[PDB]
Design a protein around this ligand. Sequence first.
Ligand SMILES: Cc1ccc(Oc2ccnc(Nc3ccc(S(N)(=O)=O)cc3)c2)c(C)n1
Length: 299
Amino acid sequence: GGTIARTIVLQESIGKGRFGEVWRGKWRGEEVAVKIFSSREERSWFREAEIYQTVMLRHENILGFIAADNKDNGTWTQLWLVSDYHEHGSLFDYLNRYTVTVEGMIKLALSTASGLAHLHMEIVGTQGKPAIAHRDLKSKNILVKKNGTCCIADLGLAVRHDSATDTIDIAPNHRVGTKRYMAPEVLDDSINMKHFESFKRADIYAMGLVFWEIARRCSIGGIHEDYQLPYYDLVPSDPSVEEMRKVVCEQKLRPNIPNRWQSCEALRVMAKIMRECWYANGAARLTALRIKKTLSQLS
Ligand SMILES: Cc1ccc(Oc2ccnc(Nc3ccc(S(N)(=O)=O)cc3)c2)c(C)n1
């Protein structure tokens, strides 16, 4: 019989995501995480399985993928994505629960940037990995390991670049990601979707907003800021594209960078990075590689 879903016992409901219900389960004694999709969600299940099975994807800062599989309970069929299980949940959950040291902030920002750098990087060869842009990077799509480093997950909305023919592996649909985290050029539809670099640039804007989320919780001498999502001060919960666009593109606002942060060297390097991810012109933004180097030198 099958060697995956067949032998997995589900233990705890984690919650309903955009696509896929998440569960914590047990696989030959080991804790695993399982995304369950229904048969009418086959497209999203397949696409996410496809991305995670990209040659040479595995990296310690991308979620460790185990298998896609089917499970027939006798009444209906379930479509399964199985992965490593991370007890701390998302970077969102961790930043709400906890404050971090300077050491902790740098681990979270570095590991995240290393994950994105791996995604973005083309590796030549037959086993060579295609460049990949996430398209929905946000604190809820990044998980926190026990060792205090991040890994990027929820790769269902990702696009892959064929550098041989300069084509993207899907016919992309405008504005698929989380509205709050969409880059300006996404919010106003000026993004050139027939340029793969444009997708990598949108990811960098989103990562800047995530770094901001982290930096707020770095507690030095007792001083830290409460957890907020980006633009908590400017837009409602569940903001519309129009609400986001009026703030990010018309009023040209970005999350606030507190005075406190220029006191410390680490927060000053982080603050400089945020601003250099938040340019309205994607071309001027830092690359994930360049950000990885900087946080490596800082650490
Ligand atoms: C392919 C796949 C399978 C499962 C999965 O879900 C996971 C994977 C790894 N770790 C977790 N852990 C986790 C634990 C708690 C919570 S929370 N926020 O509901 O407490 C969220 C995620 C979930 C994801 C994102 N992708």
